[PDB]
Design an enzyme around this catalytic site. Structure first.
Site, mmCIF file in Angstrom:
data_model
loop_
_atom_site.group_PDB
_atom_site.id
_atom_site.type_symbol
_atom_site.label_atom_id
_atom_site.label_comp_id
_atom_site.label_asym_id
_atom_site.label_seq_id
_atom_site.Cartn_x
_atom_site.Cartn_y
_atom_site.Cartn_z
ATOM 1 N N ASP A 1 0.815 -1.210 0.000
ATOM 2 C CA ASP A 1 0.000 0.000 0.000
ATOM 3 C C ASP A 1 0.852 1.265 0.000
ATOM 4 O O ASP A 1 0.439 2.293 0.551
ATOM 5 C CB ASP A 1 -0.960 0.023 1.192
ATOM 6 C CG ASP A 1 -2.239 0.790 0.897
ATOM 7 O OD1 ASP A 1 -2.537 1.016 -0.296
ATOM 8 O OD2 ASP A 1 -2.944 1.169 1.855
ATOM 9 N N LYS B 1 2.112 4.668 -0.923
ATOM 10 C CA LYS B 1 1.528 5.843 -1.558
ATOM 11 C C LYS B 1 1.778 7.040 -0.647
ATOM 12 O O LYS B 1 1.960 6.860 0.564
ATOM 13 C CB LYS B 1 0.030 5.641 -1.812
ATOM 14 C CG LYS B 1 -0.809 5.534 -0.551
ATOM 15 C CD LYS B 1 -2.283 5.721 -0.864
ATOM 16 C CE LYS B 1 -2.935 4.401 -1.227
ATOM 17 N NZ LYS B 1 -4.326 4.594 -1.714
ATOM 18 N N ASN C 1 0.002 7.430 2.858
ATOM 19 C CA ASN C 1 0.269 6.501 3.947
ATOM 20 C C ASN C 1 1.605 6.754 4.633
ATOM 21 O O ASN C 1 2.080 5.890 5.378
ATOM 22 C CB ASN C 1 0.214 5.057 3.439
ATOM 23 C CG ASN C 1 -1.199 4.600 3.143
ATOM 24 O OD1 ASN C 1 -2.164 5.303 3.445
ATOM 25 N ND2 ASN C 1 -1.332 3.417 2.554
ATOM 26 N N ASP D 1 -1.159 2.361 7.703
ATOM 27 C CA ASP D 1 -2.107 1.540 6.954
ATOM 28 C C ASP D 1 -1.504 0.200 6.550
ATOM 29 O O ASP D 1 -0.764 0.111 5.566
ATOM 30 C CB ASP D 1 -2.626 2.284 5.718
ATOM 31 C CG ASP D 1 -3.949 1.728 5.221
ATOM 32 O OD1 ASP D 1 -4.342 0.631 5.673
ATOM 33 O OD2 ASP D 1 -4.603 2.392 4.391
ATOM 34 N N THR E 1 -3.470 1.436 -4.714
ATOM 35 C CA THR E 1 -4.017 2.502 -5.538
ATOM 36 C C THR E 1 -3.539 2.344 -6.982
ATOM 37 O O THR E 1 -2.405 1.914 -7.217
ATOM 38 C CB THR E 1 -3.613 3.873 -4.987
ATOM 39 O OG1 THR E 1 -4.030 4.901 -5.892
ATOM 40 C CG2 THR E 1 -2.106 3.957 -4.789
HETATM 41 C C1 LIG Z 1 -10.966 2.786 -0.378
HETATM 42 C C2 LIG Z 1 -10.941 2.789 1.141
HETATM 43 C C3 LIG Z 1 -11.113 1.323 1.771
HETATM 44 O O1 LIG Z 1 -10.927 1.420 3.089
HETATM 45 C C4 LIG Z 1 -10.504 0.133 3.782
HETATM 46 C C5 LIG Z 1 -10.036 -0.908 3.068
HETATM 47 C C6 LIG Z 1 -9.651 -2.080 3.717
HETATM 48 C C7 LIG Z 1 -9.747 -2.186 5.108
HETATM 49 O O2 LIG Z 1 -9.364 -3.365 5.731
HETATM 50 C C8 LIG Z 1 -8.186 -3.256 6.649
HETATM 51 C C9 LIG Z 1 -10.228 -1.123 5.837
HETATM 52 F F1 LIG Z 1 -10.337 -1.192 7.191
HETATM 53 C C10 LIG Z 1 -10.603 0.029 5.200
HETATM 54 C C11 LIG Z 1 -11.138 1.195 6.015
HETATM 55 O O3 LIG Z 1 -12.275 1.156 6.440
HETATM 56 C C12 LIG Z 1 -10.253 2.459 6.310
HETATM 57 C C13 LIG Z 1 -10.658 3.368 7.316
HETATM 58 C C14 LIG Z 1 -9.892 4.486 7.581
HETATM 59 C C15 LIG Z 1 -8.666 4.722 6.821
HETATM 60 C C16 LIG Z 1 -7.787 6.001 7.119
HETATM 61 O O4 LIG Z 1 -8.104 6.753 7.938
HETATM 62 N N1 LIG Z 1 -6.533 6.235 6.319
HETATM 63 C C17 LIG Z 1 -5.748 7.359 6.567
HETATM 64 C C18 LIG Z 1 -5.797 8.279 5.319
HETATM 65 N N2 LIG Z 1 -4.579 8.269 4.767
HETATM 66 C C19 LIG Z 1 -3.569 7.499 5.758
HETATM 67 C C20 LIG Z 1 -4.280 6.912 6.734
HETATM 68 N N3 LIG Z 1 -3.691 7.358 8.115
HETATM 69 C C21 LIG Z 1 -3.541 6.413 9.207
HETATM 70 O O5 LIG Z 1 -3.856 5.300 9.083
HETATM 71 C C22 LIG Z 1 -2.949 6.904 10.484
HETATM 72 C C23 LIG Z 1 -2.561 5.996 11.506
HETATM 73 C C24 LIG Z 1 -1.987 6.480 12.696
HETATM 74 C C25 LIG Z 1 -1.789 7.900 12.865
HETATM 75 N N4 LIG Z 1 -1.272 8.640 13.883
HETATM 76 N N5 LIG Z 1 -1.302 9.968 13.581
HETATM 77 C C26 LIG Z 1 -1.836 10.112 12.355
HETATM 78 C C27 LIG Z 1 -2.171 8.796 11.851
HETATM 79 C C28 LIG Z 1 -2.748 8.305 10.650
HETATM 80 C C29 LIG Z 1 -8.280 3.844 5.854
HETATM 81 C C30 LIG Z 1 -9.071 2.691 5.580
#
Ligand SMILES: CCCOc1ccc(OC)c(F)c1C(=O)c1ccc(C(=O)N[C@@H]2CNC[C@H]2NC(=O)c2ccc3[nH]ncc3c2)cc1
Length: 340
Positions: A156, A158, A161, A174, A191
């Site tokens: 993943d 990109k 992330n 992620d 992506t």
């Molecule tokens: C097409 C979409 C399909 O979505 C899935 C597809 C598959 C799946 O299965 C596993 C899923 F669960 C999902 C989801 O529902 C899902 C729910 C929320 C997010 C999300 O928020 N992404 C952020 C945006 N860009 C980076 C990410 N940032 C962090 O992760 C992070 C972590 C720790 C941190 N600390 N401080 C800052 C900070 C940031 C992503 C996916």
């Protein structure tokens, strides 16, 4: 003498101990948190800046709907994310402090990184100078070396992330598509602009895709746009499989050579996948100025540091539609997530 490295070890050890000692034990916490802002959304949930009430410590809590994960048959990938995050340990990997679950949701509580995603800074700047991109790429290279040594594929890569911490270093996030692969795997994920040719061809692939992604990443960081950009996804895939890439005129010769070797459609000729493996990338002339040990130890001064204002400030983060999280009075999909 050598007594100062002992002081550095002790300081890092105290930071680690505090970060272990203040979080709740796994699957022991409840919604004992103030929810401040949504940092990102997805198909099954979101990620929220969060403040633990009893500690005042702030985290990034990934909340997932169990029913939605089950209905789309994504149990294994979410369990993979949690298990991998709790099993790995590397300076440039986001830290999973603790986790819990209730009647409705899964909760992955991670360290909060207030500097925001690399994609935001890249879009507001335009592009990075080649030393800037090299600073980021060296950390990505070390992270992929570690992960692949553990037989893990990230899948993943990109700009969205890659979080930037207060010291300007990268925190990879992620891991929903990360998988421990011995041999081959077939899942279509990632992506479109970053997909490797073998993924588009549905041929079965291995860790080499990661290195392909790295190429893309570097290109984007150095150019402001992906190598195979197009308006429609079909043209993106055609350009990816075409085996052809055109570089901007300002690209140096070493960068162009490295990218041509990373964006090799032929698996047998792609850097990172050859006999010397990651060394083929680490000994490249583009990385000649890179002190790998110093980068790993985070002793190199970063080229860019986000302007911060304390934990809880989210100016470096995009704005998302905020929702209220409700938990049912009945437990959903309990046996499905018994291992979470
Ligand atoms: C097409 C979409 C399909 O979505 C899935 C597809 C598959 C799946 O299965 C596993 C899923 F669960 C999902 C989801 O529902 C899902 C729910 C929320 C997010 C999300 O928020 N992404 C952020 C945006 N860009 C980076 C990410 N940032 C962090 O992760 C992070 C972590 C720790 C941190 N600390 N401080 C800052 C900070 C940031 C992503 C996916």
């Amino acid at each position: 003498e050598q007594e100062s490295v002992k002081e550095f070890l002790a300081k890092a050890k105290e930071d680690f101990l505090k970060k272990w000692e203040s979080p709740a034990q796994n699957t022991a916490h409840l919604d004992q948190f103030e929810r401040i802002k949504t940092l990102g959304t997805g198909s099954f949930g979101r990620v929220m800046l969060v403040k633990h009430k009893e500690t005042g410590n702030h985290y990034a809590m990934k909340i997932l709907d169990k029913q939605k994960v089950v209905k789309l048959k994504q149990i294994e990938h979410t369990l993979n994310e949690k298990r991998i995050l709790q099993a790995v340990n590397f300076p440039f990997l986001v830290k999973l402090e603790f986790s819990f679950k209730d009647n409705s949701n899964l909760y992955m509580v991670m360290e909060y990184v207030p500097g925001g995603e690399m994609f935001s800074h890249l879009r507001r700047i335009g592009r990075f100078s080649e030393p800037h991109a090299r600073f980021y790429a060296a950390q990505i290279v070390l992270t992929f070396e570690y992960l692949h040594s553990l037989d893990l594929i990230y899948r993943d890569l990109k700009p969205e992330n890659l979080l930037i911490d207060q010291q300007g270093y990268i925190q990879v996030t992620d891991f929903g598509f990360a998988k421990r692969v011995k041999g081959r795997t077939w899942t279509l994920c990632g992506t479109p602009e970053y997909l490797a040719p073998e993924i588009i061809l549905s041929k079965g692939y291995n860790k080499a895709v990661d290195w392909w992604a790295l190429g893309v990443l570097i290109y984007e960081m150095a150019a402001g746009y992906p190598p195979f950009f197009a308006d429609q996804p079909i043209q993106i895939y055609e350009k990816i499989v075409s085996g052809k890439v055109r570089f901007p005129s300002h690209f140096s010769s070493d960068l162009k050579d490295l990218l041509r070797n990373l964006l090799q459609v032929d698996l047998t000729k792609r850097f990172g996948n050859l006999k010397n493996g990651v060394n083929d990338i680490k000994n490249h002339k583009w990385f000649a100025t890179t002190d790998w040990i110093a980068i790993y130890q985070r002793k190199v001064e970063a080229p860019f540091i986000p302007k911060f204002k304390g934990p809880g400030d989210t100016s470096n983060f995009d704005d998302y539609e905020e929702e209220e999280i409700r938990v049912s009075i009945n437990e959903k999909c309990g046996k499905e997530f018994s291992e979470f």
